[PDB]
Structure formats: structure tokens, C-alpha cells
From a paper:
Co-evolution between cereals and pathogenic grass powdery mildew fungi is exemplified by sequence diversification of an allelic series of barley resistance genes encoding Mildew Locus A (MLA) nucleotide-binding leucine-rich repeat (NLR) immunoreceptors with an N-terminal coiled-coil domain (CNLs). Each immunoreceptor recognises a matching, strain-specific powdery mildew effector encoded by an avirulence gene (AVRa). The Bh avirulence effectors AVRA1, AVRA6, AVRA7, AVRA9, AVRA10, AVRA13, and AVRA22 have been characterised and are recognised by the matching MLA receptors, MLA1, MLA6, MLA7, MLA9, MLA10, MLA13 and MLA22, respectively. For both barley MLA and wheat Pm2a, co-expression of matching receptor–avirulence pairs is necessary and sufficient to induce cell death in heterologous Nicotiana benthamiana.
In contrast to the pentameric wheat Sr35 resistosome bound to AvrSr35 of Puccinia graminis f sp tritici (Pgt), we find that the MLA13–AVRA13-1 heterocomplex is purified as a stable heterodimer and resolved using cryo-EM at a global resolution of 3.8 Å. We observed that the substitutions MLA13K98E/K100E, located in the CC domain, impede effector-triggered receptor-mediated cell death, therefore allowing us to express and purify these proteins without triggering cell death-mediated protein losses. In line with the SEC results, negative stain transmission electron microscopy (TEM) analysis revealed homogeneous particles with a diameter of approximately 10 nm, suggesting a 1:1 heterodimer of MLA13 K98E/K100E –AVRA13-1 rather than multimeric resistosome assemblies. Local resolution analysis revealed that the core region of the complex, and importantly the interface between the receptor and AVRA13-1, is defined up to 3.0 Å resolution. More peripheral regions such as the CC, the NBD and the first and last blades of the LRR show resolutions above 5.5 Å, implying their flexibility in the purified state of the heterodimer. The overall architecture of the MLA13K98E/K100E–AVRA13-1 heterodimer resembles a single effector-bound protomer of the pentameric Sr35 resistosome. AVRA13-1 adopts an RNase-like fold in planta reminiscent of the crystal structures reported for E. coli-expressed AVRA6, AVRA7-1, AVRA10 and AVRA22 of Bh, all of which share a structural core of two β-sheets and a central α-helix. The higher local resolution of the cryo-EM Coulomb potential map of the interface between the MLA13 LRR and AVRA13-1 reveals interactions of the effector with multiple receptor residues, specifically from the concave side of the LRR and the WHD (4A and EV3). Visualisation of the MLA13–AVRA13-1 interface clarifies that the two basal loops of AVRA13-1 (AVRA13-147-74) play an essential role in the interaction with MLA13 and receptor-mediated cell death.
Author numbering:
A (entry chain A): 2 to 131, 143 to 541, 555 to 956
B (entry chain B): 25 to 122
Amino acid sequence: DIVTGAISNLIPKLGELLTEEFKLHKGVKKNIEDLGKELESMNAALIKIGEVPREQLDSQDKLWADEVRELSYVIEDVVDKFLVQVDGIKSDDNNNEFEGLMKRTTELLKKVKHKHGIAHAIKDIQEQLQFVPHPTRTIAIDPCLRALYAEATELVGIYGKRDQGLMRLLSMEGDDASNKRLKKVSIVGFGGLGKTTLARAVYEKIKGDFDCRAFVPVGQNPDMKKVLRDILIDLGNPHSDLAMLDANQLIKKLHEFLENKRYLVIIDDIWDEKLWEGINFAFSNRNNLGSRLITTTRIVSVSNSCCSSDGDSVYQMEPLSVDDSRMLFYKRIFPDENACINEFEQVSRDILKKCGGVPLAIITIASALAGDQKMKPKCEWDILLRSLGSGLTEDNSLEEMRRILSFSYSNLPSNLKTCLLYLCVYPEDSMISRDKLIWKWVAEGFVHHENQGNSLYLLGLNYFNQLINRSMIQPIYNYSGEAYACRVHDMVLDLICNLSNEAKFVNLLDGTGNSMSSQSNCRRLSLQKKSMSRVRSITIFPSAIEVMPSLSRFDVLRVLDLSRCNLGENSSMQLNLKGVGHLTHLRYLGLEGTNISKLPAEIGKLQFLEVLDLENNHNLKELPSTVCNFRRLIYLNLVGCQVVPPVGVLQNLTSIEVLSGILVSLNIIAQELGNLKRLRELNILFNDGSLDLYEGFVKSLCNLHHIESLIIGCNSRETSSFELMDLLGERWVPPVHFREFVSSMPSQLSALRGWIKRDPSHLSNLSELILTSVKEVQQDDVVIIGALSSLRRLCIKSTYQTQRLLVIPADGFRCIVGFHLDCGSATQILFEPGALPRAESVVISLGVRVAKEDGNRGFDLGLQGNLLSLRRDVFVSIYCGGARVGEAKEAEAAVRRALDAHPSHPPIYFEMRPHIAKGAHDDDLCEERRR
Amino acid sequence: GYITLGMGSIHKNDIYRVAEHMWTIDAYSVPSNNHGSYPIFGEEINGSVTRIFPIVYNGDDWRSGDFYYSVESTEDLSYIKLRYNGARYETCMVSSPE
């Protein structure tokens, strides 16, 4: 948990300080020697005491609430001071004061454990207790996960749109006295049964029989001002501007619109219980016309208060069968074969009767069994079993299903608990980029620095995959099948928020501030619309800029985020960066998207930064002439900014692992490029070109043995030079784990063939290859590219083409998701039957051919009974090359005929580049030339 | 003279040139880090076809990288829309030049 996590990282930290700094001072080292032994004993003792819950430690837990948690901060306040400031100010006497508190804590551990009844594990501690950037790829996202979520979203559709019973209870069958009375029916269900989708079917299919209609969500806002404003928009029709209104007058406000009007409104996604009565009061008593009010809710007890009157009815979605539920469960664990555990298999299914077999509870328990492989005997049958309530009809509220999500939370291994809790600072249903989140975990320090000298980013990536693995965060895929964003489930957000506000880990401001002081310590604040010197993490979203204090009043701050905000050089907040000097502890200064005028001259005085993200700033032109003390930074992103690097300012920056967006002038590419031995990703832009510049770039790149991503581009309009690509292919050899290669410069595939037969370890990690200026694509070139075992995205263009045809072999391209071969007028493309097993999108061009078949034939590609896995659009160009319009029109129809019996029905598009679209005369007598 | 959306503001006299230049370049010619190659054909309104091409926050042209804005238009500068991926989809209509 939090108490052990915050302290478990200081032991390696101060151990490194002894190795790096404290070895110089013999007197201090002896004092820190006492500090080291007590910390090793104390934190390990807390782990042993960690079996006992925090709240039972009245002496200790309240002491975090008073001293220890602040002691873990004031120590960290001087630990970060030890490196530079204490090295200059010599604040040794502070250590004597603190070690006394730990000595009392050591005495407390001897006493508190003895008094509370815990085993005396202080003297028992002596008896019982006692280079490479890639440490270990812990896990990748399970391939079976993508298909499992696909079926679940498709399964909810079938189990939706079954409102035959729902229509029966609507009482809208004919004419009756009961039909003339008000009948407000409420529907309730679990979190995932899919009643929200179903409620639309009645709304759409009943439009004709009803004069007016309405549908507006409520969300997780327990307020009446928002819902009344939303309701009045579409009562039966728009009613002009009614923003300035009161809740009390809503009785009259709805009176002037529906005093005797047949009203049909639907309110969905509500967590409020008394709202039903309030609108009912505004709807008066039962009328004599006949109207229906349908409301859905995920909380039965809330809906019970909403639906507790005579005539009203409750309708809930059934559990997902007993046979169809096994499909969503047996796929995640045993993809191929299993006949060993069936009694435990079946009895674990019946456990879900507490919810009945709802989709959310099935995935959360199932995936906890297998993280990367199968597991030992479960033993879960003795903990949760059946005795945990019975929510078929009465415990289905936040009494039983909450416990199921709570059980999986406590089985997460150690450090993942603190990482998951941090996601509370984001709003509902937000988009969380993978790169931004991981680079923030490192800044605060939630990744244990294991193996002493490995990249923190890779270890952080391992944590994110494991969270994706079980159930905690839902992936959002992209082209070539990768997870570049994540989402949090609705109910899981509730569990995180309640657990976070109990331990006061993160404070969320609703928009008016929180009265937290003294005992209610403010530690990490998230802002979504004195005595605050103890804050150490502030985050602002681009809707609450108007409410923020100046930057001067901060002294221990660590993380400052202003992404997408309006800091810039506009508005009326006086938000100039001047005054950033008194912030000599920062670890994350993210000015992601503000219109920054000039970087402050004192920015270099903060010799502790690790990440600096200027993701987009058009008017930024120069870095300050003081960036030479930053020897602890890993991130530097400069894309979207036209900045010229100063001379001799980049050499002593020897901590980089990623650099995105720079230029080259004379020798910066050689004098101060090979020294950075820790660089892993490189993104560069070239302005001019000559042999005295490319030679320097190639020589430096040979000394970077730990590079895995490379991107090269050109800025000048003229690109007649072929020098850069040919020089790179003759000397440089790729490393063992090279991943990405993107280039827009003119290139040749003879150079790529050279790298293949030079590397001792053949290219087995190059997952992408983007080339937009290739000249020649020969038959021997396609086979070599098709033999790579990890390629996932290819895009090659062609110019000055001189070959007549190309074929894609059946035994070849294997893990390809995107194919973008678009050679010119020549090179008729003929796909080998039954190829590209996993392709999801293709683009292919064809031309006039001729001289290929003796007789006049319709233009035929290979597409009949081929590409059995297409999902998204398919694109085929068309080139005339001085041909007949009738032939071109035939080519358009011929291609569309083949992809019509495809048993997936993907969309098909076409585009005629020479723009044949004209007055449309068939006997056009040739159209144009290649231009 | 602006168009407001989820979190940004784009000056009106720049969306027009993006809607026009996208009908002179080739189709599926500019690759992207995510999503795919652009411009992409869209659904049909009042006949003809539509195209989509990304735009940047300030309003300049987009060459490569990542984007969260898009412009969809027809080949008359009559039906024009602004698209925002961001947190959630949000669509606004664009008036026509006169």
C-alpha cells in the first residue's frame, strides 16, 4: 500500500547517495551508516507489520497523519537537498535531529509491537528477517484479449433489442382508461448488461405514435441545475434561451410547456434517487391523456426510491444465460484445450449468481487466474464462494458487486496498487495516452530502481501491460494493432475514488476548493473545474486556468503540468514564466501546447529536471544560453517548434534517452552527437545537404550502440541529392533490437539488402518501414522484405519505375496489418492466391498493361476468394497511361466485382488520378499523358 | 470570426484553404503515425463524395505526426465540417463563403 510504497524506494535512493555523495565525508558517512541500518530495519519492519492493517496502528498510522508521512517527506526534502544544496550549504545538523526521531521510531517499534501484541521483530530481525537498458520484458498484452472484447460488444447487441416484454408493460397497446393515466416505468440493471443501448430502440420505434420525444443523459453529476437546463432544451421542442432559471420555479417552468400536453421524455444514466419525485411534482399528478416516463439506473436502491409507487413497474435485464456465459469466460483461460478442471470450472461459474453472470464480474475474476500462463489450484473457492451476499434482486446494488471488484484489487502484486490509484486525477471517460502516463510515473518515482542502472521507461512499460492484462484498464487499439491509449471502466472509477479519498492520497477539487488543512494534509492536488507550502504535485486541466495562484508561492513542488492549457502569451492571467527560479525541486515541467513566447533565462538554474516536453510551440525560436547543467534529464521533445540549437550547448547533456526534433548547421551533428551513449530514440530534420555534413552524421551514429528508433526528414523543396541514404547503407550496422525506421529522403532497397547480410543478428525487431521516395522495387526486393519475422506496417512509394510486374508470394508476408505498395504506371500487381493472412487494409495500383494477354481482356487482379481477413476499407487506384475511357470504366467495374462475394463486406473506394471525370465521352481517343 | 469547439478556436480564414488543397493532392499519399493514410473518402451528401484531412491547433498545414482535428468538405466549398477526436467526438457545422 501507500505507506510501504513511499518508503520502499528511499532505501535504494539513499544507498545510491552513499555510493555517489556520502562516501566523501567520513564523519557524515558514519552518521548515514546509522541512517542506513535504521532505514533498512524500519522499512522492512513496516513490511512485516504490513500484514496488520494501517488503521490498527493507532501509534503509527496517526503518526503518518502527523509526523511519519511528513517525516518521509522532510527526509526526502533533505535527501534531494543532499545532492547539491546540502553539498553546498552543509546542513548536517538536520540529520542529527531526524535520526533522533527515527531512534524514537526504532524505540517505538520495540515498544509499539510489544504493546500491540505483534511479534517483537526487532531483535528477531537478526534471526528471522536477516548498464543494459533492457532489464527484462516482463510481458506483452495477451493476443487473445482483443478478440474477447470484440465478442462482448457484439454479444451485448444480441441480448439487446429484445424489448418484447418491455413493450408489453408500456401499456401502449390500444385505448383504455388505464392507458390515459400516467405510467412512469423505471428500468434498472448492472454495470454492463446493456440496457442503455436497448432504451434507444423504444425511443426510435415509437416516434410516429407520440407527439413529442426526448432523450438526454445525466451522468455522474448529482446536481439539479444541469438536468433542468438539459430537460428544457427538448421537452417537446426547443424553447429559446432558458439558461437563467431556478429549481423552485421548475414546477411553473414545465407547467407553461406541458400543462395538458402529452409528454414523452426519457432520463438515463442517473445516480440520483429523489430526482424522480421532483420531476413528478413538476409533472403534477396522474392525468387523463396518457403518457409514459422511462428511466434507467445502475443502482437498484436508487431506482427503488425512484420507482416505489403503485402502477409503476421495475424491469431488469436477465443474466446472460448459463451456456452463452461460458463463451466470455472459457476463451480467456483455455484457448485450445483443457479437460482437467471442470467441477471447479462449473462451480466458479455459479459463484457469479451473486450478479447472475454479468459481463463485468466475469472478466474481473477470470483474468486474475491467468496473467501470462495457467495457474496452480485456485483456492479462491474458500474466500468469496457464495456466502458473499446474494444480489439476484436485493444485494445487486453497491453491496455485493462492489465486493467482487474489491477482492481483485487486493490480489494485485505490491507496486501496481500505487500506480493504479494515480488514475483518479483524470475526468470520466477521458483519453489517457500511454506515453504521457508512463513518463509521469517516473517523475514521481513509483518504479523501483531495480538492477541498479536500467532504463526506468521500460520497467514502467511492464507495469502498464500487466494492468491491461487482467481487467483494470481497457485498451484502445490503432493501426497495426498496438495500444496507444487506455480507458477506465465506470464502476472501477468509483472504487478508485473511494479508496483514494480514504487515505487522502489525491485531492480532487470540484470547482470551489476544499477546506483541507493541518490534519487534512494537502499532498497531491488535481484541479478539474497560505499554508500550502507542503504541496508536491499540482495538475491543471484546460478549463480552470482562471482559478490559480502565482508561481512564486511554492518551495517543495515536484510535478507541474499545464498541458493543453492557456498559459501561453494571451488571456488576462499574467501567466509569465518569470519567477520560476524558486522551484529548485521540479521533475516534470510539461508545457505541452501553450503559445510560449520565450523560455525564461533562469530555467537552467533548476538542476534537477528529468523530463521537459514542449510538444508544440510555433513561435519558439531559440533555447536559452544556459542549458548545460541539466545532467539528469531523459526526455526532450521539440516537434512542431522551429528552434535552432545553440553552438556548444548540447555536448554535456549526457543523460538523454529520447530526442525528438532538432536541426543541423555545421558540426553539431558530429562534435556533440556521439557523446550521448544513452540515446534510444532519435528524430531529426535536415535543412541543407552536402558531403561535409552527412559524413559527420554517419560517424557519430556508429558510436550509438543503444539506438532502436530512427526518423529522418528533409525541409528544402529541392531533394535531388541521393547522398544521405547511400552513405548510411555502407558503413552503419543496426543494433540487435532496432525497431523503427522512417525516412522521406530518396532511398534505394539495395542499401536495406546490405544491412540484412551484415548484422550478426538478422533484423528481428524492425516492426515498421516507411519509405516515400523509393526509386526501384524489383522482384528480389519483395521476397527479402517478406521474410522479416516482425514487420507490422509497410508503406513504399515508387518513382522512375522500370519493371513490368510484381507478385506477393503466398509463403511470405505473415504478420502484416497494413500494406501500402503504390508503384506507378507500370508494374501490374497480381496477388498470389491465399496470401496476406492478417492484412487489415491494402492499397494497390494498376495500369494499362497490354501485351500481357493475346486477346482484349478485362483488367483482372487477384482478389477473388482472397484476403480473408479484411476489416477496414480497401483502396485501389487506377492509371490510364494514355488509354481509352471505356477500358478505364471497365477496370473500375472489374475490381468491384471480385470484392463482392467477400464474406466480410468491407467498404471499397476508387479514385482516378488523371481525373477522367469530364463530359464523359466514351470515344475520347486517349485521355492524357502520365502528367 | 472564429469557430469554437471542445477546447480550441480556429480562425475562419484558414479552414477554407485546407478544404481546397485536399482536392488537388493524390488520395492516400500522406502517412501518419496513428490512424492511417490521408486524405480519406467519406460518406456522400447530396451526391459526389467527401474528403477528410487533418489540421493543427494553430491552423497551419499538417505534414506528419499526430493530430486531433479534422476537416471534411465537398468539391464546392459549400458543405464543410470540423471534427474533433480528443476526449469525445464533437461536430460543428461551417458556414459557406459568399
